[PDB]
Subunit: 268 residues, 4 copies
């Protein structure tokens, strides 16, 4: 009776109740999904946060840079959902980039070690998770990652833009591997959403003027989006992710769905 | 239980039970929609076809090159669904290109009158239907058209490739208009499907090699005789589950377009 | 010494001295090219215009909607350049769209008859000219058309945007035909240039604050463009066309070169 | 007379006389450029290769993973062309990916340490060199890097494809910076060319079929054994004849990427 009814889905990337992952988790559960959650580093906090989700779901630790976490991942998921059950869905909502690689910090000044950390967490880990989880996914399954359209450069996004371009390429190759399991792999390219990560970043760049520029970003995005855009609401993005986790897009893989109000299809 | 529960949706393009529009209509009815169908030219023939759909639905004549048909359409639709009710969905699943514009016929030999007719039916008509039906569409509604990825030239598709390129551009402008009504506009780029147009327009102007090639490039495979995955994709767009996508193209092609070999 | 030394190039599209084609013609001549020119309708006026070019050049009438003009073109060109001589280059710098298909006139209110004529002249005729001239082109030859990037919708450009999308598609097919002859076919996507088509034709469709809307277009373009953009200067565009007419892009065909200051590569 | 007469141009990436950089260098010199060359690893062996060039040019050492090399680059480059002289061109023609990231080795088995090294050398180093060399570039100058179209996935190319996607994105940011110096930044996406990297990196990770399919898809054909058309394109970008193109990608692939089949 729900869009994701009877589906077991892993969701990564909850850190705050504003996280896009949190809303993906909320909407999936509203649509009848049974979730496993993964969290990085602050697991007591994430536990308290996810108490506020509609239903109780098991939380597993996963630092995508930790090889041991990746190697034990499938075993721990299987334990969490019960032996014999497989995942129908996997959500990658994970991103990171050192401040040097962001903002008004000069593009040329980011040291490779910083960039490389960012790309490891933001792009490579999409292949890492897929590698760890594909052997426990059902045919008809769906892996989804979060994207921010990096086809053109822009202020501030800097090296994360580069990491997303890498992510887009990784996704196309994940699809080749995933297809062997009858599993789809796609990205959702979202417009700007007022998550705490989003606001910290622009705030890290512009400081005292960050609040104003954020309101201006919202105005510009809403104007260019033919159906408009609400930065305060992650629901449309979360629904798009759930659509890809459902069986209603069975012939789409290696691809990118734009949940950005249609802004990227307009010049002005 | 139903992805499109309660929605009122107009579906154009049904001519046989292999039509992508037929499968779109079937699946939508299965998912709780109520349809109004439109047919070009063969009304008695289409009526027999549509009698095979899981539920009966009113059938309206529509020639997209006929100005009077377009002018009467909204009123005719309202008459069929009852005053005070509006559409939630519109499906544009039509196209045509004269033989000279297709297959092994030389690209340079297609006369403009031929090309022009093809573009009228396959691309302009998307704006035309939108112009006619937007005044009777509900907020949150959705207009969906059928595309075949024309970003790179290819044998056989010739001038229809040009018509599809125009359509994609048209779709982005319809989205600006449709947005004023709170309505989305998108295309589904489908992989090759065994339809009347496939056999009679394309094949008539010349396929097994095409199925194999497409199935190879597609990471999850491709079945030319199964329009259902395409139909489901259109339904996804007609649903409330892709509420932030407009002016866009969704690829229901097995992932073929994301792979070089 | 000259980039196009010894080459024989047909240039269409000159109507005023602000025409992109006029500057393409000037620079080509400065680079040692020998030219044949084509003009539509106002041929006395055009001839007065072309007298201001650095060098003499035959002027032939060509209305791309006139089948008879198209059928006699090769013969009139060959008569102009001498028998046993062929063209090395062809420039299509031709566009048209009735006022109804542009500006603040509603997108839905443009009749297909208006749009169709616009597509005939702006898109289909690229195939027409190629059909007429390919039999009189040397291997190593080059056909170039003028584009305005239509991959995203925008205010005002309206149905001309659709024509340009059609033209891009046509160019990919012309490339397959031209290939047999060892001839390249490409488009130059220029940024906005203050020709009279811009200021008067598009400008006239813009309503009351037309000038301001066009200046705003320039400011936005200059800003997005990493090297900036000057709407008053067609020379970077004319040079780019000449680059495609030269032997220095011998492996590029069916393609688009962006002479737009790099604006299309930047979101903001 | 020469396309690049009096232009001072740095060219990285020569390792054998099949290198794309070697042919870029050869064509630039034929067109009157004064070159400075950089090499990695076996510089004495590279010197033997660079001696085969038309004119003798200074060879400097540059490992792009070496912060000292990068920090001293401009100083050493200035020493080579003379104090008071600046560069007009910079050619980035380098890249690398460990075997684990290539060919028949499973995509999922490449350790990040390996991928990272490949991304560092192949993509980040484009920004690295720009940062080092922009302060000694004249207005009107041109930075060019080599690309292989990564917009779709493909067998064998694997993680290098990902590095190329990074590079394309890096190029767009390098353009923003280079613009402040009146300098252009672009990539050339080349078709397949028989080089040491083609043979040792890609080939050992596994060939003739690649050439045929590319030549078939290219409207003007394509020759894997001929790097000259690619070198010419790079020189076009180094010249004054593409002065309005930046942050972009020019395809020197025989038009292959514009055709489905
Ligand atoms: N907020 C937006 O506007 C926006 C727009 C488009 C795309 N995105 C993408 O959506 C996803 C989530 O972003 P968000 O806006 O919700 O911010 P967020 O801070 O809520 O989510 C980012 C997540 O990455 C996790 N993470 C960081 N390092 C990790 C590691 N080593 N191992 C495992 N997890 C790690 C964090 O703990 C966090 O949960 C990202 O991929 C982001 O780039 C965000
Ligand atoms: N079969 C495929 O492989 C495939 C792949 C991608 C996209 N498409 C697209 O899907 C849509 C439907 O095509 P199909 O494959 O189902 O073939 P089809 O023959 O089953 O449907 C084509 C329809 O166009 C309608 N039509 C033609 N002229 C008309 C007019 N003047 N006014 C109103 N309607 C008119 C026909 O009556 C018919 O029902 C088209 O837009 C087509 O290009 C088909
Ligand atoms: N001005 C810009 O900003 C700009 C930007 C990108 C692309 N373009 C393109 O460049 C080309 C030239 O436009 P322009 O800006 O130089 O304005 P323009 O008016 O000087 O050039 C347009 C030309 O088309 C010719 N033409 C119209 N109908 C014709 C027909 N039936 N047969 C033969 N010729 C015909 C006109 O006579 C004229 O010479 C067009 O294709 C246009 O779309 C212009
Ligand atoms: N050969 C092809 O088919 C082809 C096609 C398209 C694009 N490309 C690209 O063109 C460029 C040249 O490659 P190629 O085909 O000529 O092979 P190549 O082997 O002749 O050149 C590759 C170069 O990378 C250099 N390099 C590796 N690590 C380095 C480091 N740490 N610091 C500085 N330089 C380093 C090598 O020493 C070498 O000279 C590359 O970026 C490549 O990816 C090659
Ligand atoms: C200008 C901002 C545009 C919108 C946007 C916001 C937050 C994002 O998320 C991250 C970005 C950079 C580094 C870590 C994250 N993250 O996910 O925490 C993102 O990718 C895109
Ligand atoms: C070669 C590739 C074959 C795939 C394909 C088949 C049928 C299609 O339908 C049409 C084709 C040509 C002309 C009108 C139509 N039509 O029905 O709209 C279509 O668009 C694409
Ligand atoms: C928002 C506006 C974008 C302005 C850029 C531009 C200017 C002039 C053009 O040329 C024409 C346009 C319309 C009708 C006839 C012509 N023409 O070429 O004569 C063109 O194609 C593009
Ligand atoms: C599929 C094969 C496509 C053809 C091709 C051959 C060699 C290339 O060169 C490299 C490859 C892998 C790693 C480093 C390099 N390199 O030269 O820098 C390249 O980029 C592309």
């Amino acid at each position: 009776t729900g869009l994701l009814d009877g589906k077991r889905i892993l969701v990564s990337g909850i850190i705050t109740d504003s996280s896009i992952a949190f809303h993906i988790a909320r909407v999936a559960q509203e649509q009848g999904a049974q979730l496993v959650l993964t969290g990085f580093d602050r697991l007591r906090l994430i536990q308290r946060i996810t108490d506020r989700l509609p239903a109780k779901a098991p939380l597993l630790e996963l630092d995508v840079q930790n090889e041991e976490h990746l190697a034990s991942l499938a075993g721990r998921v299987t334990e969490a959902i019960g032996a014999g059950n497989k995942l129908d869905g996997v959500v990658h909502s994970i991103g990171f980039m050192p401040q040097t690689g962001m903002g008004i910090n000069p593009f040329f000044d980011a040291p490779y070690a910083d960039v490389s950390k960012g790309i490891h967490i933001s792009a490579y880990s999409y292949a890492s998770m897929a590698k760890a989880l594909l052997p426990i996914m059902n045919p008809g399954g769906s892996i989804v990652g979060m994207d921010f359209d990096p086809s053109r450069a822009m202020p501030a996004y800097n090296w994360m833009t580069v990491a997303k371009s890498a992510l887009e390429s990784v996704n196309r190759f994940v699809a080749r591997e995933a297809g062997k399991y009858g599993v789809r792999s796609n990205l959702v390219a979202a417009g700007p959403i007022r998550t705490l990560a989003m606001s910290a970043i622009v705030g890290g760049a512009l400081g005292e003027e960050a609040g104003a520029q954020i309101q201006l970003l919202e105005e510009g995005w809403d104007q260019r989006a033919p159906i408009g855009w609400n930065m305060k609401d992650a629901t449309p993005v979360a629904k798009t992710v759930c659509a890809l986790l459902s069986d209603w897009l069975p012939a789409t893989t290696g691809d990118i769905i734009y949940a950005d109000g249609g802004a990227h299809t307009q010049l002005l």
